[PDB]
Amino acid sequence: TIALNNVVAVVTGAAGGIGRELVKAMKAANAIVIATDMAPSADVEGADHYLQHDVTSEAGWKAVAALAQEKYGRVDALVHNAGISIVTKFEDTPLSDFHRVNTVNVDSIIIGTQVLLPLLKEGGKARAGGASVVNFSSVGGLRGAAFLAAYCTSKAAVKMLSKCLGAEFAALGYNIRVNSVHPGGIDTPMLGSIMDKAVELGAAPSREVAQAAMEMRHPIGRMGRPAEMGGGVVYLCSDAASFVTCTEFVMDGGFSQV
Amino acid sequence: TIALNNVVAVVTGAAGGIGRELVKAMKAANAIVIATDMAPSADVEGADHYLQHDVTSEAGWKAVAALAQEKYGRVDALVHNAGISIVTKFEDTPLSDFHRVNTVNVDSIIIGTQVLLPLLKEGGKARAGGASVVNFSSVGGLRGAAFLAAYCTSKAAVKMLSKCLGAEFAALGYNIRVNSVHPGGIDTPMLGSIMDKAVELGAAPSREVAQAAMEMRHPIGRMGRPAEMGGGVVYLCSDAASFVTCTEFVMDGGFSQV
Amino acid sequence: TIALNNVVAVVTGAAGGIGRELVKAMKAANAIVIATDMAPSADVEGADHYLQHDVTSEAGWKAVAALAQEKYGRVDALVHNAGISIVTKFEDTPLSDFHRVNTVNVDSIIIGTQVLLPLLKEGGKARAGGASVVNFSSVGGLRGAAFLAAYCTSKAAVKMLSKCLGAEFAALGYNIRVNSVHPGGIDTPMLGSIMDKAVELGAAPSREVAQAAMEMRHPIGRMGRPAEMGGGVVYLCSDAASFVTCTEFVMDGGFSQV
Amino acid sequence: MTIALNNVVAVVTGAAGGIGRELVKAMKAANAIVIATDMAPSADVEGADHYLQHDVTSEAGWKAVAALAQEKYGRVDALVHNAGISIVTKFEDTPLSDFHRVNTVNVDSIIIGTQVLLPLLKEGGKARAGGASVVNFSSVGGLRGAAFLAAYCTSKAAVKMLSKCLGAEFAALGYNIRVNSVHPGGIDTPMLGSIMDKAVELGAAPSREVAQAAMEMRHPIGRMGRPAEMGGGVVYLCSDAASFVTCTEFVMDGGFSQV
Amino acid sequence: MTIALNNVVAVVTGAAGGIGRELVKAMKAANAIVIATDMAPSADVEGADHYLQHDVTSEAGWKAVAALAQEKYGRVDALVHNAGISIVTKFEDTPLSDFHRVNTVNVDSIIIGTQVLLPLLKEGGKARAGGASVVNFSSVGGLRGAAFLAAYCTSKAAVKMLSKCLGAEFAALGYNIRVNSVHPGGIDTPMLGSIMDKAVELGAAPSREVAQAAMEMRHPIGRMGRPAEMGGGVVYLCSDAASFVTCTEFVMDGGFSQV
Amino acid sequence: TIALNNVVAVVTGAAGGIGRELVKAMKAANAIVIATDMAPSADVEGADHYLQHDVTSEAGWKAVAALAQEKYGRVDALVHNAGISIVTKFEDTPLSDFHRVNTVNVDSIIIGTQVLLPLLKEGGKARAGGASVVNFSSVGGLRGAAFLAAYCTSKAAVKMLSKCLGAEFAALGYNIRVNSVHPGGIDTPMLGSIMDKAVELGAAPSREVAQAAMEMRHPIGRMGRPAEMGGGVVYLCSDAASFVTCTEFVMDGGFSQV
Ligand SMILES: NC(=O)c1ccc[n+]([C@@H]2O[C@H](COP(=O)([O-])OP(=O)(O)OC[C@H]3O[C@@H](n4cnc5c(N)ncnc54)[C@H](O)[C@@H]3O)[C@@H](O)[C@H]2O)c1
Ligand SMILES: NC(=O)c1ccc[n+]([C@@H]2O[C@H](COP(=O)([O-])OP(=O)(O)OC[C@H]3O[C@@H](n4cnc5c(N)ncnc54)[C@H](O)[C@@H]3O)[C@@H](O)[C@H]2O)c1
Ligand SMILES: NC(=O)c1ccc[n+]([C@@H]2O[C@H](COP(=O)([O-])OP(=O)(O)OC[C@H]3O[C@@H](n4cnc5c(N)ncnc54)[C@H](O)[C@@H]3O)[C@@H](O)[C@H]2O)c1
Ligand SMILES: NC(=O)c1ccc[n+]([C@@H]2O[C@H](COP(=O)([O-])OP(=O)(O)OC[C@H]3O[C@@H](n4cnc5c(N)ncnc54)[C@H](O)[C@@H]3O)[C@@H](O)[C@H]2O)c1
Ligand SMILES: NC(=O)c1ccc[n+]([C@@H]2O[C@H](COP(=O)([O-])OP(=O)(O)OC[C@H]3O[C@@H](n4cnc5c(N)ncnc54)[C@H](O)[C@@H]3O)[C@@H](O)[C@H]2O)c1
Ligand SMILES: NC(=O)c1ccc[n+]([C@@H]2O[C@H](COP(=O)([O-])OP(=O)(O)OC[C@H]3O[C@@H](n4cnc5c(N)ncnc54)[C@H](O)[C@@H]3O)[C@@H](O)[C@H]2O)c1
After folding, report:
1. How far is residue E172's CA from residue F216's CA, in Å, rounded to a whole number?
2. Between E185, E241, E251, which is nearest F231 by CB?
3. Binding residues for NAD(+) 2, per the UniProt record (chains A, B, C, F) (predicted)?
4. Which atom of ligand 5 sits closest to the CA of residue E186?
């Protein structure tokens, strides 16, 4: 069946709403989890290790690589879950706001995957199914939205980078699977901020009309819970997903398909 | 834990290449499996029941509903895996060949889902995550191909029917998730026949050049194995996929994404 | 530039809301237009010929082929614009309602293209850019919707048949381009009926709430006008579109992309 | 001609390139007034009413384009972001600065240029019921990934999504500005030439002849596109005939993305 | 489809000669990739994608052809053995070494060349359902004897029979390689010119005008052929349209052999 | 290339296995095709005209001449493809069976060529390469066979008549090329009947042993397909064959040469 026995996993943004549930779900499937986030310390349920880690910092990633190299000699699963959102009027958005969103959401994947590539190649030799890189995109990487230009653009970049790396790592014989995950509206502080900033921009009349509109756009009729992201990430990280690479893995309550 | 504890599952085309692996995988996750196919009897490893079942027959589906109703009182998971393929020159394809492919690949889902809907509504009350309907489409439902007009058209119909039923069942409050599965080239008798018929048509120079070309179109660089379909179907049927409806679930080695 | 000089065009459903505007637009670009519909006679502005034509009838299509063969010796452009819609509850929809929608929307393209294929091959020799087959799909062929299972399934079939025929006709050297057109909500009797039947079904509270909801789902903020379909069809039929085949040509005010 | 650009003031970037020259010819043939821009200090661009030296990465360069359009016409009806670059690289040997260089030319060009020309595009939006038209050059590479094209493909997917967001935002704010992405397949230009050669040097393809034949066969139509085959599509998107077309992926790829 | 050589990698020997130049033009016009070879260190062969210096009697020369085809394309779809010589002699004054010289160019060329290119032709056999195509230049002289042409006629009959044997053998071994012989009549080239002049010097003919008229009258069509009239036949044999043609005598002789 | 631009072509036995493929191939090379056979009507793809035509009837040939004269003023290509076979014991074959085979296979060419000669002379003026007469002989016109005395004798007569007419038309300055075509075993109803009658005669043990024996006599190792006759006939009819007259054009998979 679907398990992560003898899987050494790195999860970024691990102290966030989705991140904490990914760590719990992956531990429950018997993974060894290195959890990382911006805080100098955190109590992340299911983590075997916590590291302070700015995903924009090559030095931060080298510290993750050093701990994994010393303690395990490989990385089997890399979950790029760290990200930010802004809600802005395009004409009032300086180029530096696009660049800040790009640095956290996309450069994180480029720097992190380059630094951990030797360790992922070892993951590729440890399991016939391959090492697994899971990149957090969004339904915002599939469908546009007014006032989300910077966020949506970065999440479409994440999606396409996933396809290119899946194809490249397979062509070079590294046995590393790369997939993008596309959550719908998930009940976390990030969705909260986006909704509030939508109201202050005057995109929505009130926070109640905004919430009801967003809920109704999902065919399933509600926001997702962070725990509903866990199974999908466990599946992609497992040998059960040995024929899954370059894929858009959608967990959006039907949002993108209507 | 991605599991199918207390899940009553119906799997059609269960004696086929993928079907046998679906039954094994679902039993291994603790499902009760009603396996069905065209043969009057079959030894399907992991099946609790086997029924002779032509998926084009309303009477055949009523016999499946009667056994499930009598023995369990619900259906938690319905896997529409039965399907056929033809390879033909469009101009030499009579309308009756399109209709034959449509009857097995699409009408099966319409008739079967209508007949089992009362039992799926009971599945919807038995699990918070919902009853799960899994429709076998294809990468051929996403991307066209010369000489596969009848097959590809039917698999695109399967894909869109999945989106419509997911949205409709959610709007009516039935708590039934509906998803389409899109396998790439999977090593089964069906792929074998398609490749041989492609050679006889003169679409491919030889069966060796056809095989190498098809393998190279997959970024992962090979055909899939039937067992590689099992985990994905178990995930979609489980409560772990409670936020997954109307979705294209792709298991294609990256075929569709390059 | 974009023109249809010396283009012999067949347009089905030519007496409908979009059809009449397609005939006007194509005449204005200097096409010779054979207009066809169900009525025994019609005054279709811009038509050089009108034929009574049931697109579900092989005999009806042979009569179109005979007139084109006798008067011009080729067909340069074939616009499959004839189509119907129903709005229904899936569980109350007999298989015969799916079949009726399939026969008009899909079998029309299969029968018509097979019957006109010799004449389209002559179109393929008359213009370097190729003969052009334009199939009317829908945003309903791209995105699912509650209560539109029969319609959406048929329009996804139209879309995929277009991809397969584009690829097949190119592989066989016929120089015939095939593309699908995907209108959003266009202000015609068909959209009118769908909205009214949605009210009678109880899918929408009132015809005013339905209209406002459908308008708001389009980023552009309104229904399309039938005339807004004309330029796109003229483009696809012209030599300006010589590198366009197998394509989804979307005219939906942004509907599918948010 | 019934699809036309009468009284359309058009800005076309990368106008001296393979596709750009054909866009200018096609748009002039549909009666547009064309401001052509590229990196060269001077160029003879057939159909251009004006040529400006213009680095699309420069806010100051864009302000000079805005000043000429403002002074001579008082509006911009059509903005074609056609300037772009490609690189072909091994991901693990690609410094972050190479991703940033590709992003700056292919994406920041659209952000800076559209911000600077927004007042003039708003005037375009008042001049035609159909709206001002912004046409962003993405790629089939913005729809489908490819080994060794990580930096290029990522930038072209960003272009595609930015197009959808701006189409939706400009409509929500009532500016009457249509925004669409164009997705060419393999078009016979120096850019496709360089990509194929660099693919050989990287050892992605055995020879330049096997690479060319493989790329041609991936297109159902069975050949590369010619630059002229991009012209009609861009004319259509810029015209009032496309008044119901915004946020759209406009594909001119010989069927590449659909098989 | 029709008769075409799309994605056909073709080797043509004696490509700088009268017939050879027309074969290269005709095969390029049908969209073949043509590797042209002849004795000159360089030549301007219209329609050739590559020219190689190549003595068809040299195993090393053939290995250089195989290396270029292997490196650039990975297969050979069509091999046209067009290189040949003629002599006109009195049998009793013809040393064994003159027979051997004609045999080496006209026959050993086909044996050495086909053996060296066989791995590449097997790949041609996998690339097309119709098969790789080997086209051997025989002659009406390989069908009908003639006074004073003993060395030439003997070599051209050997070419004809080798073609039948290789067609049958390659089919029995499952290689999917078609082999056919081509039998031109009198074609207006330097070779026909020399044969006629040497016939006069030998005292076979009174004058070059009486020789020409006699040879023309032997052809029912009433004239010599033009080199361009060989092109279509070779294109046909090299194409998938000839998928049921192997071991065959393909005659282009104005009726010479049939009266 | 090799093409039939502005070529007016008459093809007899055009509704048969090879004949239908000849018409398709010749239309694909841009010929104007007058297709003829014994049925009062037929749908022959690529035919510009169909005529009911018994090739043994001078009156039937005059009707072909009248249509060509009225509509085009010339014939550029004449394909004598109509023929029959019998399989018999010589000693049980009455003289009238030899005469019936001679009338269809040989007298057809004599009558047809005499009646169309004025129109063929005009074709000789219309193209430098000449009018082209293509006579269907057989490998049976080159090599004898037990039980095929009547058929083989007629096909050798066809072959020699071709040589004589090629030489005579050139001597008289008409610019009309005449060639014989020699198919091997081609997969058509005619080969089917010959094989079955070979079994009934007791020439072969079974229809499977007969088929395998006949296939093995062809060096290429199989029967030909009717489509494999097309390119050869197009070549002979084209200006590319301007130096080809009196010739045996063999399409026999090597049958005659081992
Ligand atoms: N919540 C949703 O509706 C939703 C929808 C689509 C996609 N996503 C994606 O899911 C992922 C997780 O989002 P979430 O809802 O859990 O949000 P969250 O903000 O709750 O968690 C994100 C975490 O990322 C961390 N982080 C931010 N910048 C960092 C940096 N430079 N270095 C290291 N860590 C950094 C934050 O500290 C935070 O703990 C993100 O990539 C987000 O874009 C979420
Ligand atoms: N194998 C591939 O490469 C591939 C690719 C994409 C899609 N698929 C789909 O996956 C599913 C399983 O395919 P597979 O590869 O195992 O093929 P398979 O032929 O091995 O199995 C299909 C089964 O369907 C059964 N079946 C056919 N018609 C039926 C009918 N009328 N009633 C009941 N049963 C019927 C057959 O008996 C067979 O057991 C199919 O829907 C197929 O189209 C497979
Ligand atoms: N109007 C929209 O909102 C919308 C949206 C998506 C796509 N479309 C598609 O665009 C096309 C044009 O639709 P419209 O809006 O003009 O609808 P319409 O009903 O105004 O026109 C459709 C025409 O089809 C004809 N028709 C129906 N069945 C026929 C048959 N069997 N044989 C021949 N003619 C037949 C009708 O007589 C009518 O003239 C259709 O294919 C439709 O599905 C329209
Ligand atoms: N040719 C293809 O196959 C292909 C495929 C898909 C997409 N595209 C896209 O189409 C567009 C046209 O490309 P092309 O094929 O004509 O290539 P090209 O290189 O011939 O033209 C691109 C032009 O952009 C200009 N340019 C580059 N950087 C610039 C800068 N900083 N400031 C101003 N001008 C700058 C160059 O000077 C050049 O003239 C590009 O966006 C390209 O990415 C091309
Ligand atoms: N011209 C005729 O009447 C006639 C008749 C029947 C057969 N053919 C045959 O057609 C073919 C072409 O003849 P053509 O008339 O064009 O003659 P040609 O002399 O014009 O050309 C023959 C070519 O072969 C080349 N060649 C000779 N020895 C060679 C060697 N050792 N290695 C490589 N190249 C070598 C010559 O340099 C020349 O370019 C020959 O095989 C000839 O025998 C010609
Ligand atoms: N098929 C083989 O194996 C083979 C081998 C050698 C040569 N051939 C020759 O090829 C040609 C085509 O044969 P096929 O295999 O297509 O057979 P076929 O029987 O399918 O076609 C022959 C056609 O000739 C027509 N015909 C017969 N008598 C006629 C008459 N009196 N007037 C007009 N039409 C008449 C028939 O109606 C038929 O349509 C014939 O000349 C045949 O002898 C066939």
Report:
1. 10
2. E241
3. 17-18, 37, 54-55, 81, 83, 155, 186, 188
4. 3
Q: What are phi and psi of C48, to 5 degrees?
A: -85, -25
Q: Which residues of A participate in the annotated binding site for NAD(+)?
A: 17-18, 37, 54-55, 81, 83, 137-138, 151, 155, 183-184, 186, 188
Enter the tokens of residue F18: 């090879």
**Residue A128 amino acid letter:** A
Q: Residue D252 and residue D255: Cα distance in Å, rounded?
A: 8
Solving technique:
X-ray
User: CA-to-CA distance for C43 and E163, rounded, in angstroms?
Assistant: 69
User: H or E segment at E168?
Assistant: helix E150-172
Looking at CA atoms only, how far is residue D206 from chain B in angstroms? 15
- CB burial class (10 A; 0-12, 13-18, 19+) of residue E115? exposed
Taking every pair of Cα atoms in chain E, the longest distance, rounded to a whole number of angstroms, is 55
Residue by residue, DSSP assigns D191-256 as HHHHHHHHHHHHTSSSSHHHHHHHHHHHSTTSSPBPGGGGHHHHHHHHSGGGTT--S-EEEESTTG
List the binding residues of F for NAD(+). 17-18, 37, 54-55, 81, 83, 137-138, 151, 155, 183-184, 186, 188
Instruction: Using the CB atoms, write b or e for B25-49: b if 16+ within 10 Å.
Output: bbbebebbbbbbbeeeebebebbbb
Q: What residues does C181 pair with on adjacent strands?
A: C136, C249
E56 and E14 in contact (C-beta within 8 Å)?
Answer: yes
The whole-angstrom distance between residue F120's C-alpha and the CA centroid of its chain comes to: 17
What long-range pairs does F141-149 form, CB within 8 A, spacing at least 24?
Answer: F141/F180, F141/F182, F142/F182, F142/F248, F142/F250, F142/F256, F143/F255, F143/F256, F146/F203, F147/F87, F147/F88, F147/F89, F147/F90, F147/F198, F147/F201, F147/F203, F148/F85, F148/F87, F148/F194, F149/F88, F149/F90, F149/F93, F149/F98
| Binding site membership of D85 for ligand 4 (Cβ less than 6 Å) | yes
Task: State which amino acid sits at residue C34.
Answer: I
* Contact F26 CB / ligand 6 (< 6 Å): no
Q: Which of B127, B87, B112, B115 is nearest to B241 (CA)?
A: B127
Would you tell me which residues 95-124 of chain B have a C-beta closer than 8 angstroms to some C-beta of chain E?
none
Interface of B with A in 212-251 (CB under 8 A): 219-221, 224-225, 228-232, 234-235, 238, 240-248, 250-251
Instruction: Assess contact for B101 and B108: CB atoms under 8 A.
Output: no
Distance (Å) of CA F109 to CA A203, E27, F157: 85, 35, 10
CA distance D221 to D214: 13
**Cross-chain CB nearest to C258 (options A144, A219, A257):** A144
Query: How far, in Å, from the CA of C84 to the mean position of ligand 3?
Result: 5
CA-CA distances (angstroms) from residue E134 to E28, E137, E175? 17, 10, 12
Q: Which ligand is nearest to the CA of C226?
A: 3
Nearest CA in chain A to D151: A161
C198 vs C147: CA distance, rounded Å: 8
Whether D152 sits among the annotated catalytic residues: the reply is yes
Query: How many angstroms from the chain centroid is the CA of residue D179?
Result: 12
Q: Which ligand has the minimum distance to the alpha carbon of residue C107? A: 3
Chains C and A touch (3+ CB pairs under 8 A): yes
Residue among E8, E122, E126 with most chain B CBs within 10 A, to mutate: E126
> Can you tell me the distance from the alpha carbon of E200 to that of F32, in angstroms, rounded to the nearest whole number?
49
Q: Nearest Cα to A127, choosing from A77, A80, A83, A167?
A: A77
- For residue E89, what are its two tokens? 């002699």
To one decimal place, what's the resolution in Å? Answer: 2.0
User: What's phi and psi for B7, nearest 5 deg?
Assistant: -95, 120
Say if CB B81 and CB B11 are below 8 A apart: yes
Contact D59, D65 (CB under 8 A): no
Order across the sheet with F32-37: list the strands: F49-52, F32-37, F8-11, F77-80, F131-136, F176-183, F248-251
